[PDB]
């Protein structure tokens, strides 16, 4: 078997070679490619990239934050993870016109879309219990009842809610798939930062799969990563060039430390990564 | 230059070889693979598969039917396309607790979601003008004014309208991409009947790209076909393996006979398939 990270590095080679120049919303400033797909096996290994360190604590703590259904960036920052803070800033919110929202109010992002799709969004601290659609539970339930179902889909893209978010999700939807008691997951990521973003988004959905496969009593299969606008920022061309030279270490292993039955009962101390020795930045 | 149809036949060979037994809703009866991707060029050619004849009239009529905001299957059947009739059947409906619902009424399917996303569906006759997000136009608008946008997405998956609709979309969403005056499109297909529905599905979203590009004054680039549950029904295996022995004829071309300002002004008589030489069956 070849390494799973060799797909990610190969995707960088392609963008560096055949990628064309394209700007984002600020004028920057990228080398882009439209349409990619890589498959990462989760079978007795966890696709946490090794040619550079990945913020696993950020990965883990953000997902639980999503699963909680939280939409307040302060509730995440308390755990020492700051990747969402600047979007709930007391000035950036007014930049989008959201002057009425208090500090932290991202609007109807992932956690709200996952647990309460369709619901009318009030504030961060409003209780949306039983309101909307808990498609995360619908996923877990459907897997338990009809594993053959070709509809196990959790969509975070709500066209009604787009003008109310800090920014539209880079992960439109994910779809789950069960065969031979193996749970597999495909993620559709509309936009991907191969340098900074992408490695984080592989761990995040490999983790979710590991969570659901644990609950539904299945064993993790493949994680399919599908990209739309796969781009490399020009100020990363050289650091990525040197990283391509590095050789992938053996993937670590994600292990759950207690039998968890419900999904909202998962805590950051239930997961342990062992054997993770990445390259130095 | 490698022929684009080889990807389709290639996918089939993989599923026949590395595919596993997986059933569907009705106990049948397939060979499944989760996660596929193929790229079909739209540059000076149209990916109408030629190893077997594709029902282009149906491909063309169904899409105009979509743009029409239609959910009545008989509006399409009246055009010589009988592919949604059994789904809008007076019996198929009763087999889904839609005994209160009239025949042809497929529910909040594609045509509704594209033109009126987020609107309270009632029936196939009420007009939902000024209701629901017009995703189809918002796409065209954003392409005209902001081609760098990494958010041009037409999502047809609405977990709220999932009860009310007959068949939940096999085509969850499609994303558009513009660089160097080239419009590209990627479809995320929830499930794919390889030897039956897939060639039809490919031609559908290529045409849509050809339409939108024509409207937006652009030259079509690539159509990326991402698949989730890609499957082959057991009774298609031998007909498909004979089809595997065929060498693909050069793809036809799609000429637009006139000049259309708005997407709604499109008519069947504006298109002309040229150079289509498919194998028989």
Author numbering:
A (entry chain A), B (entry chain C): 26 to 306
Any passages from the paper?
The only de novo biosynthetic pathway to generate dTTP (2′-deoxythymidine-5′-triphosphate) requires reductive methylation of dUMP (2′-deoxyuridine-5′-monophosphate) to dTMP (2′-deoxythymidine-5′-monophosphate) by TS. The TS enzyme is an obligatory homodimer whose subunits associate with nanomolar affinity to form a dimer that adopts an asymmetric conformation upon substrate binding. Inhibition of TS leads to the cessation of DNA replication and thymineless death of proliferating cells, which renders the enzyme an attractive target for cancer chemotherapy. Ligand-free TS protein binds its own mRNA and thereby represses translation.
To gain direct insight into the molecular recognition of mRNA by hTS, we attempted co-crystallization of the enzyme with oligonucleotide constructs representing the TS site 1 motif. X-ray data sets were collected and structures determined for crystals grown at low salt (100 mM buffer) as well as high salt (1.75 M ammonium sulphate) concentration. Molecular replacement with previously published hTS coordinates furnished structures with the enzyme adopting either of the previously observed active and inactive conformations of the loop regions about I108-G129 and A181-A197; however, each without RNA bound. In the active conformation, the catalytic C195 is located in the active site, while it resides at the dimer interface in the inactive conformation. Crystallization of hTS at low salt may have led to discrimination against RNA ligand binding by crystal contacts that involve the putative RNA-binding region. Although the crystallography effort furnished structures of the protein in both the active and inactive conformation, co-crystallization of an hTS–RNA complex remained elusive.
